[PDB]
Scaffold this motif. Sequence first.
Motif, PDB file in Angstrom:
ATOM      1  N   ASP A 178       8.515   9.198  -4.337  1.00 46.67           N
ATOM      2  CA  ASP A 178       8.062   9.937  -5.530  1.00 46.67           C
ATOM      3  C   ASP A 178       8.102  11.441  -5.395  1.00 46.67           C
ATOM      4  O   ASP A 178       7.738  12.169  -6.333  1.00 46.67           O
ATOM      5  CB  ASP A 178       6.672   9.465  -5.902  1.00 46.67           C
ATOM      6  N   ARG A 217      -2.058  -2.285   5.568  1.00 50.39           N
ATOM      7  CA  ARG A 217      -0.760  -2.642   6.132  1.00 50.39           C
ATOM      8  C   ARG A 217      -0.895  -3.262   7.538  1.00 50.39           C
ATOM      9  O   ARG A 217      -1.847  -2.986   8.250  1.00 50.39           O
ATOM     10  CB  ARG A 217       0.123  -1.398   6.235  1.00 50.39           C
ATOM     11  N   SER A 261       3.870   8.027  -2.381  1.00 50.35           N
ATOM     12  CA  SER A 261       5.089   7.514  -1.742  1.00 50.35           C
ATOM     13  C   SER A 261       6.118   8.599  -1.522  1.00 50.35           C
ATOM     14  O   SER A 261       6.267   9.483  -2.368  1.00 50.35           O
ATOM     15  CB  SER A 261       5.731   6.429  -2.611  1.00 50.35           C
ATOM     16  N   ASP A 268       0.847  -1.203   0.000  1.00 47.34           N
ATOM     17  CA  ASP A 268       0.000   0.000   0.000  1.00 47.34           C
ATOM     18  C   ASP A 268       0.871   1.237   0.000  1.00 47.34           C
ATOM     19  O   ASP A 268       0.714   2.164   0.801  1.00 47.34           O
ATOM     20  CB  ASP A 268      -0.957  -0.001   1.176  1.00 47.34           C
ATOM     21  N   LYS A 269       1.795   1.243  -0.953  1.00 47.24           N
ATOM     22  CA  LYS A 269       2.881   2.215  -0.968  1.00 47.24           C
ATOM     23  C   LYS A 269       2.468   3.554  -1.597  1.00 47.24           C
ATOM     24  O   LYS A 269       2.953   4.612  -1.192  1.00 47.24           O
ATOM     25  CB  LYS A 269       4.069   1.580  -1.703  1.00 47.24           C
ATOM     26  N   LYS A 270       1.521   3.513  -2.522  1.00 50.94           N
ATOM     27  CA  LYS A 270       1.105   4.684  -3.280  1.00 50.94           C
ATOM     28  C   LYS A 270       2.233   5.204  -4.203  1.00 50.94           C
ATOM     29  O   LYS A 270       2.373   6.425  -4.391  1.00 50.94           O
ATOM     30  CB  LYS A 270       0.636   5.844  -2.380  1.00 50.94           C
ATOM     31  N   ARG A 271       3.007   4.302  -4.811  1.00 47.98           N
ATOM     32  CA  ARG A 271       3.975   4.755  -5.795  1.00 47.98           C
ATOM     33  C   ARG A 271       3.188   5.369  -6.939  1.00 47.98           C
ATOM     34  O   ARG A 271       2.080   4.909  -7.235  1.00 47.98           O
ATOM     35  CB  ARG A 271       4.821   3.601  -6.367  1.00 47.98           C
ATOM     36  N   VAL A 272       3.793   6.341  -7.610  1.00 43.21           N
ATOM     37  CA  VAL A 272       3.294   6.833  -8.869  1.00 43.21           C
ATOM     38  C   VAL A 272       4.040   6.057  -9.956  1.00 43.21           C
ATOM     39  O   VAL A 272       5.240   6.143 -10.030  1.00 43.21           O
ATOM     40  CB  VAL A 272       3.556   8.332  -9.010  1.00 43.21           C
TER      41      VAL A 272
END
Lengths: 313, 314, 314, 314
Positions: free
Chosen positions: D161, C2, D158, A243-247
């Motif tokens: 980013d 998480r 993140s 659930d990292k929310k990388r783009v």
Amino acid sequence: ARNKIALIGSGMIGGTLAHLAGLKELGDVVLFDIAEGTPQGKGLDIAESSPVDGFDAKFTGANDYAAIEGADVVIVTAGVPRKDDLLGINLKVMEQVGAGIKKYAPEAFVICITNPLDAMVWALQKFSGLPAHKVVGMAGVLDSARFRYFLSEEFNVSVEDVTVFVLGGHGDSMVPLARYSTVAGIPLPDLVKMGWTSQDKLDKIIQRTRDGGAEIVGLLKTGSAFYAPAASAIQMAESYLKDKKRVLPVAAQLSGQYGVKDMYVGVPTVIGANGVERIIEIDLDKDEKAQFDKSVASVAGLCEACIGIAPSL
Amino acid sequence: ARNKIALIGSGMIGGTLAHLAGLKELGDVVLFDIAEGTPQGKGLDIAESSPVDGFDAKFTGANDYAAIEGADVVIVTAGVPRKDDLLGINLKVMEQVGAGIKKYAPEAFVICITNPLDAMVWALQKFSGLPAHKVVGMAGVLDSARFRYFLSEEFNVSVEDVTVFVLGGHGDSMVPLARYSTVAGIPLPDLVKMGWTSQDKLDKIIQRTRDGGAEIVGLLKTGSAFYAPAASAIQMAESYLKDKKRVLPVAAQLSGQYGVKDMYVGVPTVIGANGVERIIEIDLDKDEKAQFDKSVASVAGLCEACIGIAPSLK
Amino acid sequence: ARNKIALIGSGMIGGTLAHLAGLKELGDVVLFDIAEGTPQGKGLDIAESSPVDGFDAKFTGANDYAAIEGADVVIVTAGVPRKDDLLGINLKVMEQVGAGIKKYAPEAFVICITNPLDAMVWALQKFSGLPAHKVVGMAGVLDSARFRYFLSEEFNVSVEDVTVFVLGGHGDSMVPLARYSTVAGIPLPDLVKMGWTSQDKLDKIIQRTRDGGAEIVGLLKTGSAFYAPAASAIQMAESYLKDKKRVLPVAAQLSGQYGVKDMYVGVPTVIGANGVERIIEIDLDKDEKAQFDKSVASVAGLCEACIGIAPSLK
Amino acid sequence: ARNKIALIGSGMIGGTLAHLAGLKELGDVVLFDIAEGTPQGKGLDIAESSPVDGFDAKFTGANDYAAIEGADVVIVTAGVPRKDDLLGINLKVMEQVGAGIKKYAPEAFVICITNPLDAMVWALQKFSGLPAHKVVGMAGVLDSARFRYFLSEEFNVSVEDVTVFVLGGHGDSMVPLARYSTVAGIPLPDLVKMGWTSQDKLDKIIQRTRDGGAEIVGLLKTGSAFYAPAASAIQMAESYLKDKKRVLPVAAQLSGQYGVKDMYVGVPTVIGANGVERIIEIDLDKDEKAQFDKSVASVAGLCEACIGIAPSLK
Ligand SMILES: Nc1ncnc2c1ncn2[C@@H]1O[C@H](COP(=O)(O)OP(=O)(O)O)[C@@H](O)[C@H]1O
Ligand SMILES: Nc1ncnc2c1ncn2[C@@H]1O[C@H](COP(=O)(O)OP(=O)(O)O)[C@@H](O)[C@H]1O
Ligand SMILES: Nc1ncnc2c1ncn2[C@@H]1O[C@H](COP(=O)(O)OP(=O)(O)O)[C@@H](O)[C@H]1O
Ligand SMILES: Nc1ncnc2c1ncn2[C@@H]1O[C@H](COP(=O)(O)OP(=O)(O)O)[C@@H](O)[C@H]1O
């Protein structure tokens, strides 16, 4: 229960996904294939490596879809290589895979790698019936990785300080945005201004990223790239599982963004525990929008050609 | 300057070694092969993957031995598959490899993988001229890894809590010591006593370890194991580069230990920044010693047959 | 969603628990304490560090137990330092912590660190009402870490190749078994036989292990160890969260093993996603059994004294 | 030989540097301090933790500078806390430290953390006599970690980013450039135009970054930040040790860039095996350049007041 990762396809990318899923401790791994022995063999080889590096994960090879039951993530490489008609064979594969995921892993986050990507992912989504936000295609992250590597070499900086912005597919269908591509926050056009490289060398880097897949094929002669593709899909899987929310640029179903509906296109997205949690929308100039529409037109035709073969779509 | 790792052979194991070296940030990597395109392609493929995980390493593919100049570690997989016939072809490969290491990477720690391992490492050490303590073979770590994995499955404990003690080479040449293999310090015969498994199951596990390579070949049909072998060689490389002093079973030149001199045998060793820094000698009972002597004798037979083909080895 | 880790106590060990949980990406972290500001400060400091290494986790500081709601793991360091009156204050803390876990994290894997450990984890289990297989005490892993480290220095081998077998608690209540302690599968008594060290130096290493906590106190002067204790608790938590089945010596509720019922005792256990999944029972010779019963007897005395203070524990 | 990291000062940051150097396997570590016991205790505690994670590293505590001999990296936190007479006390410390580095680790890459940073690093470079490209101050990476963290929260993306561009020092000496700060390559001012945030929120995040150190102090009450500072310094060490070529904002000696000579200013720099390998110079608009000049002048004034306390610096 540990996370469960199912790899539909146990070829060169498939094996590499398994290895990386083991090393990164993403969870238990099922390697599936139609070929008997292959998935069992690779799975046991990787399992047998586990004591060296210390990771605890079950590795299972299988030839029956029941083994993927309850996979949190499914990564699809199943298909045949381009040795037009690739479309027809790989579409029938997507149909088998879709039905398998539908039955055994309906709650999975699905990452498609099979080519031609944007059409195969579109078809897999429909055949599987999964919500579109849970089904994506790996392409953009690979282009972005190549591009970043080339630039890190050009400027002799760390790969970790290079960011590139990419939409579309591969090749001529890629839409790079130099102005949203940086070294440590400084966009590429200003780096040209500062004398860190020239616009001609940046154009060649861009062209090399377009041809990047073909460059690897030319070197190996007998197959295509598998390390960088595999790494790319694992990063997407990982942003989901953690659930990292990388783009991340991925092929995602658009519903109005960029003026496109009911079709997968490579766009920047935020990936988290709910799959595609957000599609990022930026303005594109005329030439950018020119290339963009050109790829959508090309993918539209592939999808129509798929509708030809499989009206069920 | 970064560590430099040269991979002589850019096949299935070679490419995996490169991927692992990238991921573990062991240094810059040169992939060498005689095949054109192959090492360049795998090398660039891996380089291109590097921004994903953020490791910084140079990957270079080469068809010229000069590319390995100054390598801190050299890992050798160069050879042809078995489709005594193999012996002759792969021996000639160790001669070429040997000559390249001697010329360009004489200070390298050398890890041999090429089969038949037990003769090829010994041949490679002679052809190259490198000090024997800087030339080892990967075998024991793979057998040990398989063995540990099977045990972790049997007992349902973590792989990290299983330890096994293996002497000799693969297959019938393996001499495993159950009494020096443990779960969390409890030896296997004790675990048999406690009912954690049975002797017959333990016996089958040892046999499976002997046949381990062949089991993967039977599954793959088209080739042999590459992930566990690569991981095993990388662990040895890493103990060297990090001066870790891991105790690893490797093919090493004996000089008196176990009554054996002038010969490579699989023995547990302490690996650090000086290569083989200590070979571990234990006492063997009469049966274990007889097993060890049979295995050493079969290795000597292989080396003698190499001498018949390449007299310079005598 | 998480994993969520709740740290009950944000002092020296607590802040280290949080840091390691971030670095190892174990999940979101709540730092709880009685002191205002301390858990908020540390949490924000560690959160602000996260972009350096690139881990994504939420760090929250709290003074309200509602903050720990739904925690997968709860690690408890809440208590006051010895500055049998200690027992009294810390038992009151366990009662508060117990009530807070019961209300807000009844499904958590709970790891107790608060001293004196052997009584506090037993009291905490009873106060909280959690199933005993979900409540363990950290101790053995630390004695084990110290011992392994000391042996690794003695023999100049990697810490990874040293295994030790430790029953009971710290100091005079530790029951180490040299015979089930190894280097690469070779038990310490054979290593003495081979000349790798002497019995007198092994004896001294054992005593150093008993005295390990007090040695750190002697050096820091102002407080006690926190890096090795934090590392030790985190390993336990990871084995739970990754269902890894590590074999770890932890203070666990015995129910017949070694002739003990209804008491917490330091024993090697398999830790997985269901908590204490197996308690390992070995045979003990007559001297080892006497050592063990004496250690268990002094833990029973301490628990009886806790019953004295808090009759609800009867 | 393993890399050797010397830590001059074994306080809160010092200990954390040591722990991180252990976890990340950067090499052997010396903890040095004026206080007896402290570095030996922290050192042994962390060594004792090492068998848990499996890193092999020596940790030494020392009160003699000869322990730092041949350090590859020296990180300096030595000084007293803020309870211009602070300038004088900490300058005296830099004098001692510089003299110990000159004698025992003249080839070290040196990272200063001691406050007030912008003067202390400059003074430390002069006392030690080391080439300036081998002596840097940790500051910008910290401000940048805080900035990014606050942004990652505002945008729900993140931390990996978010990129930010910071010139100058902490607090009012910071000169952030929003236009070279990004989310996924997209600059902040564009993100404001797109509706993902407002200029108000953005200004408040900038102000929060300026006050970031004071925010942690207001929460902890009895001390200052240590996790994010330690992580930031370790990233700098790591880029040097791995020849990574990370672009990192550090306090470095300018020699013409931005019109500034013979002074340490926070600028983004390429850090590799030769230390400061490239100082990044951008064009600044008139407002940015006025902000930069005011920050540099205030740094010059601090160094001038150091010349009055220690004339040897002129
Ligand atoms: N219908 C199918 N279902 C599952 N797997 C398939 C199907 N058709 C082909 N495959 C498999 O997909 C894999 C493709 O692997 P490969 O050709 O190496 O390409 P890649 O580079 O994508 O790994 C092969 O292992 C092949 O057996
Ligand atoms: N004389 C040689 N010098 C260098 N490389 C060689 C030589 N002979 C064969 N090779 C290479 O060694 C590699 C062996 O790889 P492969 O057959 O995949 O086995 P493995 O599983 O051991 O990697 C091939 O890439 C082959 O081109
Ligand atoms: N009743 C309580 N509830 C929660 N925390 C408590 C309670 N009593 C004490 N504490 C806290 O427990 C922590 C103990 O930390 P410290 O004394 O540094 O020891 P350790 O080495 O165990 O971390 C302190 O932060 C203290 O404020
Ligand atoms: N002259 C000196 N040489 C070495 N260390 C010193 C000297 N003066 C003070 N110190 C040490 O520097 C350390 C600063 O630690 P600390 O106050 O915790 O601040 P920080 O948060 O920067 O670590 C203390 O351990 C102190 O003993």
